[PDB]
Design a binder for this molecule. Structure first.
Ligand SMILES: Nc1cc(-c2cccnc2)n[nH]1
Ligand SMILES: Nc1cc(-c2cccnc2)n[nH]1
Ligand SMILES: [Cl-]
Ligand SMILES: [Cl-]
Lengths: 286, 286
């Protein structure tokens, strides 16, 4: 009881659903190559604007866009699907795999912040794996909730005498420009789930409200589970799941952390990178 | 070394400067009536959008707009000029006059908030008097810094499970939707200046920083000055200059305050209103 717009249909051959909410597999007619088409029912203009400008190997790339009776966003296909499907229902990833994926999430999020973009909705369902192999490339998706940086409204206000300026505004100055720390919290919640198989904060088998657990920063620590996990890995989690956003670890601090000082891991990612990049490598000036 | 655009020039005869920063007096050709033309050098689109939709006797009305090499905003002329020029350099207004003007500022700001608009830059230089008479109509101007309401970004976020939501975001929930209280602070600083002739917070003859005076909410109280002012008037000032924005008086609470329960004042404003409105009164169905 619905059709695809003529414009989309002219360029792509639509196929099977990859993930409803919907995301469909499609074939670009010109190349005969698999693509992914994200259908948004009728903020998307901001998302396209962000996507088009951003260029990193661990951030999803926009290939095409259709503004019809619904929104159609053509993206590169990720054959591994969602990271969520690897962690769902107490399923746990090996420490090495966690590092390989985490490192990439850190590089991706560092890039975003470097470029003044805050994702705001990082989750295992927004981290996509490139292949059905455990040693693969990851890419960050869903820039729907993303925000463009600048405390510009406060900065403009501060340029004047605060004769008439309310105290709450002068108070906010202390915290202002730490909105990006929300993404480091999120990564910290992601890293906990990956390593343990379980969430740090939940309403399962507890009296304390999800709100209170988070505000206090008192995560559920199950020793039996974490015993199979290194002290370095847990130290990093502890460093990102810090209530004070000014005290919280940045992507830079996390990347400098001992847990990430792994040359084997760094080499594997570089090998996966060159493997992807080998297909489109133009001969070069020597 | 500059000219007015042909489009503006086709409709208006530009005249003398009313206030630089610039604001010029002009004559609408069709009516031979005095107008005020605000020239902004190349947010104005938001300001026009707000102005066009808002309709209250104590809020400036937009008559025309020109988007040229500069921005030109045609507004109703206010022959009394800025309220700032009545309070500048220890000059003080009589209590009755303060009430008449304050009441109108409260009605104007109530309207804004009722309609989901926060002015954000209320000052005596943004309050315009209709005539050179002390008993006159006032109108609120400069919607440049104004913001359109809705905690929509937090509201959208709260619709989900906060498994991955940062604690600072859950903390902000307590305060969220009290941004309008910034305008009540501002009015409170305005009312202090009008009644006393002096500002509540300044770096003049004091050790404590302007920031600290405001954050603490410790205004400069000079008894000798305020002795000539009623306890009701000062009680209202004390009620608006409250550090906690949740505890601070709203426009509704202020309008309900004993100081404003003045039928003589309310009658005078109504008489000034009908006097302005008499010119454009269409005969009506009886
Ligand atoms: N852009 C993109 C989305 C997807 C996907 C794959 C499987 C399930 N859900 C989403 N792949 N590539
Ligand atoms: N719209 C408007 C502005 C002004 C004005 C008058 C005098 C000084 N500064 C501004 N009258 N009416
Ligand atoms: Cl179809
Ligand atoms: Cl000219």
């Amino acid at each position: 009881m619905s059709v695809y717009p003529k414009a989309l249909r002219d360029e792509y051959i639509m196929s099977k659903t990859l993930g409803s909410g919907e995301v469909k597999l499609a074939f670009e007619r010109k190349t005969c190559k698999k693509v992914a088409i994200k259908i948004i029912s009728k903020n998307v203009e901001t998302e396209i604007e962000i996507l088009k400008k951003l260029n990193h190997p661990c951030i999803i790339k926009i290939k095409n866009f259709f503004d019809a009776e619904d929104y159609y966003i053509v993206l590169e296909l990720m054959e591994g699907g969602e990271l969520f499907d690897k962690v769902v229902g107490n399923k746990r990833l090996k420490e090495a795999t966690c590092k390989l994926y985490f490192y990439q999430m850190l590089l991706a999020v560092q890039y975003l912040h470097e470029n003044g973009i805050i994702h705001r909705d990082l989750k295992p369902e927004n981290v996509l794996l490139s292949s059905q192999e455990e040693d693969c490339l990851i890419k960050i998706t869903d820039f729907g909730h993303s925000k463009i940086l600048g405390e510009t409204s406060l900065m403009r206000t501060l340029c004047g005498t605060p004769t008439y300026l309310a105290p709450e505004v002068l108070v906010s100055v202390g915290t202002a420009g730490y909105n990006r720390a929300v993404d480091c919290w999120s990564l910290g919640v992601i890293l906990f789930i990956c390593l343990s198989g379980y969430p740090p904060f939940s309403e399962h088998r507890t009296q304390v409200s999800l709100k209170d657990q988070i505000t206090s920063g008192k995560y559920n620590f199950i020793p039996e589970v974490w015993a199979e996990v290194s002290e370095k890995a847990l130290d990093l989690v502890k460093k990102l799941l810090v209530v004070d956003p000014k005290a919280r670890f940045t992507t830079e601090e996390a990347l400098r952390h001992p847990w990430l000082q792994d040359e084997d891991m760094k080499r594997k990612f570089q090998d996966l990178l060159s493997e992807e990049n080998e297909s489109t490598a133009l001969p070069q000036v020597l």
